[PDB]
């Protein structure tokens, strides 16, 4: 008989999937053009 640690529940793994998708979601506004003039286009128009 050998000690059985918490193996990290399926609830934690389910939350990791929801977590990774959530943080990148707002972080990228929406890349209009690769490199310069990415997600900052919305900011750039009203800035000028």
């Amino acid at each position: 008989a050998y000690y059985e640690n918490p193996e990290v529940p399926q609830a934690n793994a389910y939350m990791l999937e929801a977590a990774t998708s959530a943080v990148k979601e707002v972080a990228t506004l929406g890349v209009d053009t690769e490199a310069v003039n990415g997600g900052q286009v919305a900011f750039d128009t009203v800035n000028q």
Partner: protein
Amino acid sequence: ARTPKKKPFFWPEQIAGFEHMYDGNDDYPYYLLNRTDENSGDLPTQPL
């Protein structure tokens, strides 16, 4: 965060005097439980 997770169940009468054999640290490479008890002895069968 909140939930009990996979850890061994014991009885209060076989965990008596063992609290240095569980602490989350290496003070031990084994565990100890009470094998026999008064009012008819017992033998291991994985009682946990």
